[PDB]
């Protein structure tokens, strides 16, 4: 039988990653409140998550990685996000960066993983840095904001534009060691506080050529790492869909948790003004139902999309323009549905739910943040899909 | 690769029912306009559909039926509804009634199908009839409204309440021959006109006991026909989810067609007042995108739900309270999503689209009708699900 | 003097107001509604009744026997009227508001129309689809001019066309032509507002002399031939278009207010077909009735406020600045969209019976949606117009 | 000319209260950030607001009060809420309580205002207290949560149920001096932080009969203070619509501020990923337009409702069942519209807007809180109005 309201535990003889997550979930849940005040992921959480081996989800097998399918991974992040969104958000990023790093040169991957098999990277991908072309690579300078999980990473993946005979942008990623940049703690946010999305400061950072890859090359199987793992079901695929798969995952985790949290707290609810046992009133029942349907629909779309990713990777098939536009955008629609489902419950949660001692308030804030990421912006995504559906050339104004 | 915007054609040797539908679809599409003025399904349409054998979708194999899975069937209805909603709606009903008839006695099924293998039933299920208990069965009297496809059926499935010693209702279905009732043509509607949902008039109609089955018995595998087909993947299951699977299917077909129809007509769209070509303006693009996502999400939910039905039928497993509530209600949420997707396009279609010579106007009206059926009413469904999710007893006020 | 949230407040001017006069004839209009829909135009009886109370002279100058009604008072008459028959109200509103434009043309044209026949009106077709040849003394116009609501009952038509510049910039212009100059082609087969008789006008080598041509911009800015004619008027010193197009939203509000009443009437006794439970007062239905009531009351409040703003401007002979003009242009479109939401919310809970030809709900639903299909009520366009103005951007010539 | 986007400044000789608010508004705006960390209204804010005399809005003239009309008052609160919602919310309550106090006995009013003309009350109205009937009054015990502005008030209006020969509830209000209760600082909320809605602790508090009034009596012009001020345009009216007029007022102020704040911050907005200057893109323009229309409509409804209040008060006319239901509920619809308007802008504000250093984030949170008050709950209000519109008896489960 299928499950509409959450992830189905894969019945494979042994313990699946999802079951392993499920066991440590209560611990993650209890750190949530102190995680929020810490403004970064508690060490205990990283320890637990690394212990079960989730960070090796998309690490090549040759280094001791698992090469988990996208669906299985995403479902781990969804479940995790229910306990602490920020932990799930940051840890998802640390995980999915490994998938990108697998498309860089064998030389870089050896450098990261032979040395330390448990090493991970955080990122700052918006190309704000100033790049001087020196020989053997580049010198990069700039303030690189929003690096989720940066405190727990050994490296950072940093985005920049190089240029051209013609002066056209070459969007590129460099991988730099923790020693090359300062973490500037300016992370004071109103949602997903525990993600520790601090800024990375780069001062005359040299990046050699072998630690630089073109974004387009990693979208199209033309990067230095292409072909390294010919038995892999996950590396013959564009980097970005995996890169950014976690946001919507987190959004779904939060929304599914919201429905549970709301149900728990509603049962016993009494009207301040009249003194009525009011938890099972029709309006509240109908809200619970609709939000349940809305996120179930969101889940079905995501599950279908993830399946589409999986099938493509299996066949080493790169997506065509149309499926790529769907992969790029479906997650944003999912995020928008989830936020609707959360808001519908929050609107009926009452004043008590806005107190610091109510989990609902945290879920609400975290849910909204998931739709604030540049990748989950639906105005942008509606335009990207719309243009593709009408056979128009892409608008370079957005990506 | 997966398809977000429509049904995936099943990869089989020879040709699948969906491919057979796809071949005759242009013919069905061209009759659509005269079908709407006919206020019933054109003979040609029934002929074509019976020729490919779709009416034998849920007929037992022993009578030459196909015993199609629910997903495969539902997808045929979706595709069909794109060409002529009314035809798909009525024909879906004729089909799914066979699934119920398979749960009646072997004696009744032999009576219907050994005589005529291509025989079907229309229905009128709301228990408005007055029932006198005679011996050997009942005498039924009353006006039985809304019998979609009644003109093309050899029988009718008719709903009525019998009474229990105490005085509680026994909701029952009787199967009566075309000769026992008069079709009263009062079908003048504003949507799904081609379904020919005329009224059936019953005057002192005797129904013998073997042609009567309890609704609850056919929900729970306790009817006279239970066990007849021990190799069947579709008969060991409640009757009602199949019975009413077509409405949402039709709703999805319409909405997917709406997106295509709107896209076609938008390209060349010119502003009356200013004279600009305006078909690719951002607002329209974003609408096309959003409605595409909305119905894709609607499809994903339906596909998942249909899969759930299929798996249950395979294992001869009757659903528990929870899954049953989801099966009962997911379709209603799907219908609601589709209508939103249609409305979003219609709101931007302009006055032209409201002319009799525009298909959009037909799709809009037909779409809205799909949410007007008592089974797709979402207020009712929100309550049914909500109550179940909170572990409340069902409200007998609705079903 | 308590306020009314759910409909128009009847003005207590001593004696009888136009709204009361509408209210008296409303049951008659309501009963013709069904045959009006099959007629695909306004029944003669309806025009007769409405002209008898004198509503068509709402915006006719007083010198010709006109009333010069304020915009609020007029709009409210159309709202009330739309409850009984949307198509009648839609078409008749247009016949009325055209007189307001005609008052900005030359004294010569107005004399020509109204001294001859004081009860004469114009229908219109304003989208500039015609081909114009500049002859001397005027123009020769050719083309098929679609969608002329109430064209069967009009003595004239107001017809839109582009003339051209030294540099070939468009000069959007309106010509007023007599019924004898054009053929009404009956291609009006629509799925909403059927009774408006929005047939097409066919123009074959129609000569329009200069004095029967006015620039749109001139009538927006108080620079047309008729400017200054009526110095005591509280309604003619104002842009033509806001009055021109005031009726669409009015009709949309009338429909939505009627929908709430119609739904309430039909809901009380509603039984579940399946269970036989007396279900008219169930919480979901009650909450829908409430929300749609609030939504259209909000829509009304916006419209009433906007109409008041129009009235005050006209009183002071003050032309609106860019900002208020953008609000006047667009508020009605938001009102229309709210009303359609309010209707849809009720229709979604109305059940299958409400989609039968013998149910008024179905007519209200269709007519409601049509009101949001007019090029002037398109909200995507309006959102852009307002948005651009709010951010201090130049207007987008792609829309208007 | 009318104003759609804010309050019209009344043209009078001298300076209107709204102009006086407008002059001090920049000061209130600058304290907003430290007000939020203070978790109560800064002394400077109370000082400024009391200096202009706003607290005397609804104080009877005989004590030096202004007896402002509801519209004029409400508009001051709307404007004020734009600078600091919590300040406006708490100060509105201090103001509107005076209006209730005007319906108590002359004896109580003399006691409060002859002594201190600038004295105000905060409140806690939900009847959670345990009441012992002693002679001469009652002894009240209990924890009385959520008293906005309690730190700045000289008194508290406290709600409780007494009983009746037949055991019916008699909902009553008592006015108690600051010395009779302890302010327990448990106010740690996620919105409207600066309102200082701490809890009042009542231990064996004696309330004499003359400081107790029946709620129903103050709804119906039957309380001890009725008739005291026969020239008053505001006191011959139910207490509650004034009592609770400020919530929606605050909600509107926040939403109008949001539009301005969003406009300011959008102009210069660049896409992180593409470097495009993107502040004037169509989707953002359309959002600004729609949110502008939505709150304008919300304003129009409120202004109309306030007008209706004013007219009634002038004529000393108590509202009938129907208008009362509208007065009770319109404000809840207004709040719901405003929250939609804010959410639509927040959804397009991007990640930067969720940082602690962005005002948008404060406006969002504050907006949502305004719809969390028991009085602004729309599910409750939809039910109240719906029942009245259908001529049903009120549901005692809600009020
Ligand atoms: C920001 C905020 C401030 C409030 N201030 C007061 C107050 O000053 N006096 C009062 O009686 N209630 C106040 N209320 C509480 C409400 O009156 C009501 O008791 C509360 O919303 C209980 O509803 P709930 O617990 O179901 O959410 C306030 C509520 C919130 C949202
Ligand atoms: C019910 C209906 C009646 C109309 N009546 C008129 C009319 O009388 N005169 C006119 O110029 N336009 C009329 N219009 C047409 C619009 O002005 C406009 O030209 C039309 O909406 C073109 O928009 P479209 O192409 O997008 O649909 C009417 C439109 C509809 C919805
Ligand atoms: C287009 C249309 C076709 C229908 N066809 C049938 C039918 O074939 N058999 C049946 O029992 N009910 C049919 N129904 C009626 C419903 O089962 C149900 O009795 C009806 O929706 C009553 O709900 P209402 O009167 O409250 O709207 C149909 C309804 C509509 C919308
Ligand atoms: C909670 C949160 C965490 C983020 N973490 C990262 C990150 O780890 N790496 C990164 O490149 N961008 C991260 N982003 C920033 C986005 O990629 C993007 O640069 C940002 O949304 C800029 O959009 P805006 O300023 O227009 O809102 C994060 C954004 C948010 C909402
Ligand atoms: O690739 C993107 O545009 C979204 C993204 C941003 C940061 C990140 O770490 C992964 C994906
Ligand atoms: O079973 C139901 O309640 C819905 C339904 C109605 C008619 C029909 O033919 C099939 C299903
Ligand atoms: O002026 C407009 O653009 C709208 C309009 C169209 C036809 C009409 O008769 C009046 C106004
Ligand atoms: O009267 C109410 O029910 C709402 C309200 C609550 C507290 C308050 O201070 C004023 C009004």
């Amino acid at each position: 039988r299928l499950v509409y309201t959450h992830a189905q535990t894969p019945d494979v003889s042994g313990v699946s990653m999802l079951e392993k997550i499920q066991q440590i979930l209560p611990q993650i849940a209890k750190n949530a409140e102190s995680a929020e005040q810490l403004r970064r992921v508690p060490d205990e959480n990283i320890k637990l998550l690394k212990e079960i081996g989730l960070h090796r989800a998309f690490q090549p097998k040759v280094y001791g990685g698992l090469e988990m399918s996208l669906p299985d991974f995403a479902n781990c992040i969804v479940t995790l996000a229910g306990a602490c969104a920020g932990t799930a958000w940051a840890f998802s990023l640390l995980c999915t960066h490994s998938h990108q790093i697998a498309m860089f040169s064998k030389q870089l991957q050896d450098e990261i993983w032979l040395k330390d098999p448990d090493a991970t990277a955080s990122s700052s991908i918006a190309p704000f840095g100033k790049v001087e072309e020196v020989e053997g690579g580049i010198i990069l300078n700039g303030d690189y904001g929003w690096s989720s999980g940066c405190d727990h990473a050994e490296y950072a993946i940093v985005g920049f534009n190089r240029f051209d005979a013609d002066g056209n942008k070459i969007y590129s990623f460099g991988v730099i060691p923790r020693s090359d940049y300062e973490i500037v703690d300016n992370w004071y946010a109103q949602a997903i506080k525990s993600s520790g999305s601090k800024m990375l400061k780069l001062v005359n950072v040299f990046i050699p050529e072998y630690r630089i890859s073109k974004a387009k090359d990693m979208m199209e199987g033309k990067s230095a790492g292409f072909g390294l793992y010919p038995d892999s079901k996950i590396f013959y695929t564009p980097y970005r869909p995996y890169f950014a798969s976690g946001f919507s995952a987190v959004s779904l985790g939060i929304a599914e948790r919201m429905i549970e949290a709301f149900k728990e707290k509603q049962r016993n609810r009494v009207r301040a003004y009249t003194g009525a046992n009011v938890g099972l009133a029709t309006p509240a029942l109908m809200r619970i139902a609709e939000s349940t349907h809305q996120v179930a629909a969101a889940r079905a779309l995501l599950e279908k999309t993830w399946e589409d990713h999986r099938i493509h990777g299996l066949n080493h098939q790169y997506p065509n323009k149309e499926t790529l536009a769907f992969w790029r955008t479906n997650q944003a629609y999912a995020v928008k549905m989830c936020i609707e489902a959360v808001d519908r419950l929050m609107a009926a949660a009452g004043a008590t739910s806005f107190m610091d001692n109510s989990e609902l308030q945290r879920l609400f804030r975290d849910a909204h943040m998931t739709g604030a990421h540049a990748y989950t912006d639906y105005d942008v995504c509606a335009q990207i899909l719309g243009r593709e559906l009408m056979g128009m050339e892409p608008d370079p104004t957005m990506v």
Side-chain angles (χ1 to χ4, degrees), chain A residues 131-149:
Chain A
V131 9
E132 170 186 1
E133 295 279 352
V134 300
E135 74 158 294
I138 61 141
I139 288 177
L140 187 64
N141 267 99
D143 299 325
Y144 268 83
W146 313 85
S147 195
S148 285

PDB file of all heavy atoms in Angstrom, chain A residues 131-149:
ATOM      1  N   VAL A 131      37.348  38.725 -10.451  1.00  0.00           N
ATOM      2  CA  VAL A 131      38.321  37.733 -10.889  1.00  0.00           C
ATOM      3  C   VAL A 131      39.404  38.334 -11.774  1.00  0.00           C
ATOM      4  O   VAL A 131      39.123  38.975 -12.788  1.00  0.00           O
ATOM      5  CB  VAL A 131      37.649  36.442 -11.503  1.00  0.00           C
ATOM      6  CG1 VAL A 131      36.158  36.628 -11.702  1.00  0.00           C
ATOM      7  CG2 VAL A 131      38.331  35.982 -12.787  1.00  0.00           C
ATOM      8  N   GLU A 132      40.646  38.144 -11.340  1.00  0.00           N
ATOM      9  CA  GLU A 132      41.814  38.475 -12.125  1.00  0.00           C
ATOM     10  C   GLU A 132      42.361  37.182 -12.699  1.00  0.00           C
ATOM     11  O   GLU A 132      42.658  36.251 -11.949  1.00  0.00           O
ATOM     12  CB  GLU A 132      42.865  39.147 -11.239  1.00  0.00           C
ATOM     13  CG  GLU A 132      44.244  39.340 -11.905  1.00  0.00           C
ATOM     14  CD  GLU A 132      45.314  39.874 -10.951  1.00  0.00           C
ATOM     15  OE1 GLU A 132      45.012  40.090  -9.754  1.00  0.00           O
ATOM     16  OE2 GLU A 132      46.462  40.078 -11.400  1.00  0.00           O
ATOM     17  N   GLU A 133      42.469  37.123 -14.025  1.00  0.00           N
ATOM     18  CA  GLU A 133      43.122  35.995 -14.692  1.00  0.00           C
ATOM     19  C   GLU A 133      44.634  36.079 -14.505  1.00  0.00           C
ATOM     20  O   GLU A 133      45.298  36.949 -15.077  1.00  0.00           O
ATOM     21  CB  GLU A 133      42.775  35.945 -16.186  1.00  0.00           C
ATOM     22  CG  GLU A 133      41.304  35.680 -16.497  1.00  0.00           C
ATOM     23  CD  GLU A 133      40.904  34.202 -16.417  1.00  0.00           C
ATOM     24  OE1 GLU A 133      41.786  33.324 -16.259  1.00  0.00           O
ATOM     25  OE2 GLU A 133      39.688  33.922 -16.523  1.00  0.00           O
ATOM     26  N   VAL A 134      45.163  35.197 -13.664  1.00  0.00           N
ATOM     27  CA  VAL A 134      46.603  34.993 -13.575  1.00  0.00           C
ATOM     28  C   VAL A 134      46.903  33.713 -14.344  1.00  0.00           C
ATOM     29  O   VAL A 134      45.986  33.090 -14.884  1.00  0.00           O
ATOM     30  CB  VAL A 134      47.102  34.910 -12.112  1.00  0.00           C
ATOM     31  CG1 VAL A 134      46.785  36.200 -11.373  1.00  0.00           C
ATOM     32  CG2 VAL A 134      46.514  33.703 -11.391  1.00  0.00           C
ATOM     33  N   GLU A 135      48.165  33.313 -14.423  1.00  0.00           N
ATOM     34  CA  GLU A 135      48.450  32.070 -15.119  1.00  0.00           C
ATOM     35  C   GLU A 135      48.444  30.870 -14.178  1.00  0.00           C
ATOM     36  O   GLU A 135      48.968  30.934 -13.058  1.00  0.00           O
ATOM     37  CB  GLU A 135      49.719  32.163 -15.974  1.00  0.00           C
ATOM     38  CG  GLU A 135      51.024  32.162 -15.223  1.00  0.00           C
ATOM     39  CD  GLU A 135      52.163  31.730 -16.111  1.00  0.00           C
ATOM     40  OE1 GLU A 135      52.167  30.548 -16.534  1.00  0.00           O
ATOM     41  OE2 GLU A 135      53.046  32.576 -16.385  1.00  0.00           O
ATOM     42  N   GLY A 136      47.824  29.788 -14.643  1.00  0.00           N
ATOM     43  CA  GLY A 136      47.596  28.600 -13.827  1.00  0.00           C
ATOM     44  C   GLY A 136      46.240  28.625 -13.129  1.00  0.00           C
ATOM     45  O   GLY A 136      45.840  27.639 -12.514  1.00  0.00           O
ATOM     46  N   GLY A 137      45.531  29.745 -13.217  1.00  0.00           N
ATOM     47  CA  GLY A 137      44.215  29.865 -12.597  1.00  0.00           C
ATOM     48  C   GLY A 137      43.702  31.290 -12.465  1.00  0.00           C
ATOM     49  O   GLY A 137      43.870  32.109 -13.368  1.00  0.00           O
ATOM     50  N   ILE A 138      43.059  31.586 -11.339  1.00  0.00           N
ATOM     51  CA  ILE A 138      42.533  32.931 -11.084  1.00  0.00           C
ATOM     52  C   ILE A 138      42.808  33.392  -9.658  1.00  0.00           C
ATOM     53  O   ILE A 138      43.059  32.579  -8.764  1.00  0.00           O
ATOM     54  CB  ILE A 138      41.002  33.048 -11.343  1.00  0.00           C
ATOM     55  CG1 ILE A 138      40.219  32.098 -10.432  1.00  0.00           C
ATOM     56  CG2 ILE A 138      40.666  32.816 -12.811  1.00  0.00           C
ATOM     57  CD1 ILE A 138      38.917  32.690  -9.907  1.00  0.00           C
ATOM     58  N   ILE A 139      42.772  34.706  -9.460  1.00  0.00           N
ATOM     59  CA  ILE A 139      42.757  35.268  -8.122  1.00  0.00           C
ATOM     60  C   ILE A 139      41.366  35.835  -7.902  1.00  0.00           C
ATOM     61  O   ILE A 139      40.910  36.690  -8.665  1.00  0.00           O
ATOM     62  CB  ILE A 139      43.841  36.342  -7.918  1.00  0.00           C
ATOM     63  CG1 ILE A 139      45.230  35.694  -7.860  1.00  0.00           C
ATOM     64  CG2 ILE A 139      43.603  37.095  -6.627  1.00  0.00           C
ATOM     65  CD1 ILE A 139      46.386  36.693  -7.723  1.00  0.00           C
ATOM     66  N   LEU A 140      40.688  35.344  -6.867  1.00  0.00           N
ATOM     67  CA  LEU A 140      39.319  35.746  -6.579  1.00  0.00           C
ATOM     68  C   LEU A 140      39.217  36.587  -5.310  1.00  0.00           C
ATOM     69  O   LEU A 140      39.838  36.285  -4.296  1.00  0.00           O
ATOM     70  CB  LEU A 140      38.418  34.514  -6.488  1.00  0.00           C
ATOM     71  CG  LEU A 140      36.902  34.711  -6.351  1.00  0.00           C
ATOM     72  CD1 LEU A 140      36.285  35.398  -7.565  1.00  0.00           C
ATOM     73  CD2 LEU A 140      36.273  33.364  -6.159  1.00  0.00           C
ATOM     74  N   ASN A 141      38.428  37.651  -5.388  1.00  0.00           N
ATOM     75  CA  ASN A 141      38.199  38.562  -4.267  1.00  0.00           C
ATOM     76  C   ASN A 141      36.719  38.860  -4.081  1.00  0.00           C
ATOM     77  O   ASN A 141      36.010  39.094  -5.058  1.00  0.00           O
ATOM     78  CB  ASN A 141      38.945  39.872  -4.491  1.00  0.00           C
ATOM     79  CG  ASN A 141      40.306  39.877  -3.854  1.00  0.00           C
ATOM     80  OD1 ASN A 141      41.315  39.645  -4.518  1.00  0.00           O
ATOM     81  ND2 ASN A 141      40.347  40.132  -2.551  1.00  0.00           N
ATOM     82  N   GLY A 142      36.255  38.842  -2.836  1.00  0.00           N
ATOM     83  CA  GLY A 142      34.901  39.284  -2.555  1.00  0.00           C
ATOM     84  C   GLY A 142      34.205  38.683  -1.351  1.00  0.00           C
ATOM     85  O   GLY A 142      34.638  37.663  -0.801  1.00  0.00           O
ATOM     86  N   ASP A 143      33.118  39.334  -0.947  1.00  0.00           N
ATOM     87  CA  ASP A 143      32.286  38.861   0.141  1.00  0.00           C
ATOM     88  C   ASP A 143      31.216  37.911  -0.406  1.00  0.00           C
ATOM     89  O   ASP A 143      30.376  38.291  -1.221  1.00  0.00           O
ATOM     90  CB  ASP A 143      31.650  40.044   0.873  1.00  0.00           C
ATOM     91  CG  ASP A 143      32.683  40.982   1.505  1.00  0.00           C
ATOM     92  OD1 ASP A 143      33.737  40.502   1.984  1.00  0.00           O
ATOM     93  OD2 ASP A 143      32.435  42.211   1.527  1.00  0.00           O
ATOM     94  N   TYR A 144      31.256  36.666   0.041  1.00  0.00           N
ATOM     95  CA  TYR A 144      30.413  35.622  -0.529  1.00  0.00           C
ATOM     96  C   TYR A 144      29.341  35.167   0.452  1.00  0.00           C
ATOM     97  O   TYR A 144      29.533  34.219   1.209  1.00  0.00           O
ATOM     98  CB  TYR A 144      31.280  34.450  -0.999  1.00  0.00           C
ATOM     99  CG  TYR A 144      31.700  34.565  -2.444  1.00  0.00           C
ATOM    100  CD1 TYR A 144      32.801  35.335  -2.807  1.00  0.00           C
ATOM    101  CD2 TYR A 144      30.992  33.912  -3.447  1.00  0.00           C
ATOM    102  CE1 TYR A 144      33.191  35.448  -4.130  1.00  0.00           C
ATOM    103  CE2 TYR A 144      31.373  34.021  -4.770  1.00  0.00           C
ATOM    104  CZ  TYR A 144      32.470  34.793  -5.110  1.00  0.00           C
ATOM    105  OH  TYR A 144      32.843  34.894  -6.430  1.00  0.00           O
ATOM    106  N   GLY A 145      28.210  35.858   0.429  1.00  0.00           N
ATOM    107  CA  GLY A 145      27.156  35.645   1.415  1.00  0.00           C
ATOM    108  C   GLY A 145      26.439  34.314   1.348  1.00  0.00           C
ATOM    109  O   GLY A 145      26.518  33.601   0.348  1.00  0.00           O
ATOM    110  N   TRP A 146      25.742  33.998   2.440  1.00  0.00           N
ATOM    111  CA  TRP A 146      24.849  32.842   2.546  1.00  0.00           C
ATOM    112  C   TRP A 146      25.537  31.519   2.288  1.00  0.00           C
ATOM    113  O   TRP A 146      25.306  30.908   1.261  1.00  0.00           O
ATOM    114  CB  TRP A 146      23.696  32.936   1.550  1.00  0.00           C
ATOM    115  CG  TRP A 146      22.982  34.246   1.461  1.00  0.00           C
ATOM    116  CD1 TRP A 146      23.343  35.336   0.713  1.00  0.00           C
ATOM    117  CD2 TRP A 146      21.750  34.583   2.091  1.00  0.00           C
ATOM    118  NE1 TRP A 146      22.417  36.339   0.864  1.00  0.00           N
ATOM    119  CE2 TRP A 146      21.429  35.900   1.703  1.00  0.00           C
ATOM    120  CE3 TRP A 146      20.886  33.900   2.950  1.00  0.00           C
ATOM    121  CZ2 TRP A 146      20.286  36.547   2.144  1.00  0.00           C
ATOM    122  CZ3 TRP A 146      19.753  34.538   3.394  1.00  0.00           C
ATOM    123  CH2 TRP A 146      19.460  35.852   2.993  1.00  0.00           C
ATOM    124  N   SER A 147      26.375  31.062   3.197  1.00  0.00           N
ATOM    125  CA  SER A 147      26.944  29.732   3.035  1.00  0.00           C
ATOM    126  C   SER A 147      26.418  28.798   4.111  1.00  0.00           C
ATOM    127  O   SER A 147      27.025  28.641   5.170  1.00  0.00           O
ATOM    128  CB  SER A 147      28.463  29.775   3.037  1.00  0.00           C
ATOM    129  OG  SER A 147      28.990  28.565   2.543  1.00  0.00           O
ATOM    130  N   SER A 148      25.259  28.203   3.836  1.00  0.00           N
ATOM    131  CA  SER A 148      24.649  27.240   4.744  1.00  0.00           C
ATOM    132  C   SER A 148      25.607  26.114   5.104  1.00  0.00           C
ATOM    133  O   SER A 148      26.220  25.488   4.227  1.00  0.00           O
ATOM    134  CB  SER A 148      23.390  26.654   4.138  1.00  0.00           C
ATOM    135  OG  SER A 148      22.362  27.600   4.193  1.00  0.00           O
ATOM    136  N   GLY A 149      25.725  25.875   6.407  1.00  0.00           N
ATOM    137  CA  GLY A 149      26.592  24.842   6.946  1.00  0.00           C
ATOM    138  C   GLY A 149      28.079  25.138   6.844  1.00  0.00           C
ATOM    139  O   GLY A 149      28.892  24.237   7.040  1.00  0.00           O
TER     140      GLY A 149
END
